[PDB]
């Protein structure tokens, strides 16, 4: 009954649209749904030299990659979760469906 959707994405507003669409799908299909639980985001930080060789002033890049992870708990059988997750998915968001 308790099925856990984990949504991992790099973009922010696309992930918000996906989780809001899952909320609207659960509201239309009339099930007890928990709120979209945000995880603390991860900032992958790389600091390299700007110069390809070593001869220059000491300048340093800051390459950032922010990843985000939301989760939604559903109280519904498996076929409802598959029918919801099959429809309206966009490439920015990776979906992980845990049965237990």
């Amino acid at each position: 009954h308790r099925i856990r959707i984990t949504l991992t994405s790099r973009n922010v507003k696309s992930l918000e649209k996906v989780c809001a669409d899952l909320i609207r799908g659960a509201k239309e299909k009339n099930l007890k749904v928990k709120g979209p639980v945000r995880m603390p985001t991860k900032t992958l930080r790389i600091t390299t030299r700007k110069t390809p060789c070593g001869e220059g002033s000491k300048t340093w890049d800051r390459f950032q990659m922010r990843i985000h992870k939301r989760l939604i708990d559903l109280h519904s059988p498996s076929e409802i979760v598959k029918q919801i997750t099959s429809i309206s998915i966009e490439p920015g968001v990776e979906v992980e469906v845990t049965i237990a």
Binding site: T8, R10, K42, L44, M65, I67, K69, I89, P91, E94
Partner: protein, 114 residues
């Protein structure tokens, strides 16, 4: 997954996947008007759209080069049989694509225009 890779390495591996994909198709589809890729990773199916200008030239002789590119992606990245499939799509208003005009200009300089 049985190997259980982290998401920290997984998004980085997807980025290097897209980078090597873009570089390989830039080297291979340069004469045919390459403009980009867009990969939709669904469960059990991998849609991967080549965005290009000359669709007849990227399909070739009855879709032969497209099937060759599917077999390239399969053999290189270890994908299962029938798990990945490519689709060639035409660029609308291709003058705004910068890499298409760049490949057009370098092939003009290769052909010998001033």
């Amino acid at each position: 997954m049985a190997v259980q890779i982290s998401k920290k390495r997984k998004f980085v591996a997807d980025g290097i996947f897209k980078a090597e994909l873009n570089e390989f198709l830039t080297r291979e589809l340069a004469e045919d008007g390459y403009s980009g890729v867009e990969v939709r990773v669904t469960p059990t199916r991998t849609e991967i759209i080549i965005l290009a200008t000359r669709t007849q030239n990227v399909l070739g002789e009855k879709g032969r080069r497209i099937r060759e590119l599917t077999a390239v992606v399969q053999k290189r990245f270890g994908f299962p049989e029938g798990s990945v499939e490519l689709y060639a799509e035409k660029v609308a208003t291709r003058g705004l694509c910068a890499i298409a005009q760049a490949e057009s200009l370098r092939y003009k300089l290769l052909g010998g225009l001033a």
